Design a protein around this ligand. Structure first.
Ligand SMILES: *[C@@H]1O[C@H](CO)[C@@H](O[C@@H]2O[C@H](CO)[C@@H](O)[C@H](O)[C@H]2NC(C)=O)[C@H](O)[C@H]1NC(C)=O
Ligand SMILES: *[C@@H]1O[C@H](CO)[C@@H](O[C@@H]2O[C@H](CO)[C@@H](O)[C@H](O)[C@H]2NC(C)=O)[C@H](O)[C@H]1NC(C)=O
Lengths: 48, 48, 49
């Protein structure tokens, strides 16, 4: 989140891991830039 | 598809703005509001 | 905009921030309506010295 420009980069990799963050290398491509203009100091994920 | 989004913000309780990014089954929604978040937030599924 | 934003009794709809704990960041927007303090005392509720 820079100057309200909340920037998201992402990647999706097909894996077969069972219980760890997969060891390897990949680079995330920028997808969108949101003009949100707010204070982001904390965050929390949403689960099903 | 168990992780579906995030809450971002300094105070997630309508004293300030906050960002919701949430991928629901139909269409992902991105919103910046003085949201009044729940103490334990989630999304629920009927199984079978 | 004196033909658009001025009223003969005073157009008091146009607010600005008069107090803040410190300066804000480039293109940030402060909308907080919490009571500020000019003294070393804490302050609570709607008003105080
Ligand atoms: C974003 O929100 C955080 C959390 O409220 C702010 O941190 C506060 O900073 C002020 C600075 O004077 C302190 O007096 C408060 O005690 C801090 N609060 C907490 C809970 O740490 C932060 O300043 C905000 N950032 C911006 C740029 O507005
Ligand atoms: C996910 O959330 C979106 C946004 O709230 C929902 O989109 C709504 O869909 C209904 C039914 O078609 C429309 O009447 C509303 O106007 C839509 N709202 C907006 C803001 O687009 C969507 O239905 C939700 N999906 C699920 C699975 O509940």
């Amino acid at each position: 989140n820079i100057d309200g420009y909340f920037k998201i980069y992402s990647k999706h990799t097909p894996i077969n891991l069972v219980r760890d963050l997969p060891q390897g290398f990949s680079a995330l491509e920028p997808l969108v830039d949101l003009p949100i203009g707010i204070n982001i100091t904390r965050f929390q994920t949403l689960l099903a | 598809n168990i992780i579906r989004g995030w809450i971002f913000g300094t105070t997630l309780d309508s004293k300030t703005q906050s960002l919701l990014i949430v991928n629901n089954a139909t269409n992902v929604v991105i919103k910046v509001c003085e949201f009044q978040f729940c103490n334990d937030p989630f999304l629920g599924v009927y199984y079978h | 905009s004196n033909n658009l934003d001025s009223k003969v009794g005073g157009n008091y709809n146009y607010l600005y921030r008069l107090f803040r704990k410190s300066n804000l960041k480039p293109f940030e927007r402060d909308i907080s309506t919490e009571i500020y303090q000019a003294g070393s005392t804490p302050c609570n509720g709607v008003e105080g010295f």
